[PDB]
Ligand binder design. Structure first.
Ligand code: U2B
Ligand code: U2B
Lengths: 302, 302
């Protein structure tokens, strides 16, 4: 029994983390085969970050201007190019620790594990979700740039590289092809995220995890997808699609509660609050577990 | 910025996880050098667990009755002994992936990372605390027995091996010398944990993490260690010692708030509740961060 915010084991990603230095700036990079991936703003001084012309700034740079360090070893840069907001530094050594991997662009609401790093060394791992407004609420200090987010599908699917913190204190970054998630650019200006919404299909997945673990005080009614969605829009919950009802099916089958019945329970929680109770140790509705996360934890995928 | 329940990177422990089989039972073991460590109840059938005589049960067993598997490799058992509630199976191969390590018995209130495993394969990692009543609120399914908890001090300090779930749904286990934490025995009977209490020094550490991250709405008064402790005992908070005030000193020095001032803020939160607000995204007072955890996260120890 029990339910925890669980991250994937991080061993496979640790052996890929290197420290990249250009000029005075040092951040983390991802070394797979003979390429090293890092945020392109490593080439920027602080004057540069107000209005960086990245092409122009990168043109002034040659291979030997990049100090890639792997542990104590120093790698040799024999090539550099800029794919979107990511720098690709080709080096002289294939990483012998390269796992099977894919690069993946995840969807808002999906979860992934983050290995937070500084100067190329891992410091901690945690689980989080891509918010509907394409930000993440992470834990990132200066020099954590280039820390990666990932899933393990038995193969490492890298989905996120950290670039920047917004004055909000929320975090933004790119996929491993350098395309930002969200409307953000790698520049030090005022950038607004959208209004955030709650991942409704994830909250329902968690209520099922709650029932699986003996927490059932919130159950009861029914409602319609259409009727439920009217309550959700009022509470800044993201609208429940039928894909979403389908994804919850196996969870429905193992608790013997129809999705639509579970939504009626949620509607009452949204309308009436929690009246001081807790669900799985939380006094709030938790939205950072996908249905796949719940099933992975509640039957032990390794 | 940002604050997350962060676990240590798990790479070093993954390369130590093996699958141990005796009879029909299969659980996880810890392979360091030429010894493999696992819960001794691996030798038990289900009839045995009501009233196991472990010496007698282990006497019927010979080395070849133990199937230790490391990945696909099968290790050769050339020795077996029982230290308290742990079995020590000596094998023919030193593990080439053995990190620098120590065995450590932690104290109630300390935190550690758990690598949850099944059949010798890692599935997830999470951070938790030894409760004052020596239980842990984990996430453990059948066959997760022998999963280990650990800290990384730059060296892996193993502090916990999981043995059993109580009807509560909370979890109990031993140090790596096989001595249970708490009053528990490895037997399937009714076993009561103590009344649980809140780790007061950890809650204060979290309020400091809250201030560090811009959440300051709860600040204000003063009070005395003696006066504060009177409020704590009423709310089932563990009493604040002067060691505890000392440990919080560096946190005090960097936020410019005296410990005793922070306690006055907490007293009012305990007495008056949170009135619907949140602190660092939580609607409850969080007690699973030590002051060392807060300092590790808020300045990036790797
Ligand atoms: O937030 C930013 N803006 C910076 C400088 C401006 C910029 C432009 C493009 C990309 C990143 C950045 C940057 O390097 N970071 C950081 C990212 N993560 C954690 C941080 C913790 C403390 C201070 C900065 C942090
Ligand atoms: O709780 C127990 N009691 C058992 C059998 C009785 C016993 C005696 C000594 C030690 C352990 C045990 C056991 O193997 N476990 C488990 C431990 N962890 C997660 C579990 C999830 C689901 C079912 C069991 C779980």
């Amino acid at each position: 029994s029990g339910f925890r915010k669980m991250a994937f084991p991080s061993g496979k990603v640790e052996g890929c983390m290197v420290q990249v230095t250009c000029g005075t700036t040092t951040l983390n990079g991802l070394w797979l085969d003979d390429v090293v991936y890092c945020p392109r703003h490593v080439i920027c001084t602080s004057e540069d970050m107000l209005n960086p012309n990245y092409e122009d700034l990168l043109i002034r740079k040659s291979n030997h201007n990049f100090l890639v360090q792997a542990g104590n070893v120093q790698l040799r840069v024999i090539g550099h190019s800029m794919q979107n907001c990511v720098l690709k530094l080709k080096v002289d050594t294939a990483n012998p620790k390269t796992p099977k991997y894919k690069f993946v662009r995840i969807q808002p609401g999906q979860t992934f594990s983050v290995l937070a790093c500084y100067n190329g060394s891992p410091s901690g791992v945690y689980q989080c979700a891509m918010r509907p407004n394409f930000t993440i609420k992470g834990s990132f200090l200066n020099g954590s740039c280039g820390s990666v987010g990932f899933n393990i599908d038995y193969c490492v699917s890298f989905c996120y590289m950290h670039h920047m913190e917004l004055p909000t204190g929320v975090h933004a970054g790119t996929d491993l092809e350098g395309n930002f998630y969200g409307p953000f650019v790698d520049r030090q200006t005022a950038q607004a995220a959208g209004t955030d919404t709650t991942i409704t299909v994830n909250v329902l997945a968690w209520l099922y995890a709650a029932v699986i673990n003996g927490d059932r005080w919130f159950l009861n009614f029914t409602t319609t997808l259409n009727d439920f969605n009217l309550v959700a829009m009022k509470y800044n919950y993201e609208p429940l699609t039928q894909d979403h009802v389908d994804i919850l099916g196996p969870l429905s089958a193992q608790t013997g509660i129809a999705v639509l019945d579970m939504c009626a329970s949620l509607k009452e929680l949204l309308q009436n609050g929690m009246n001081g109770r807790t669900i799985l140790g939380s006094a709030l509705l938790e939205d950072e577990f996908t249905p796949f996360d719940v099933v992975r934890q509640c039957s032990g995928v390794t």
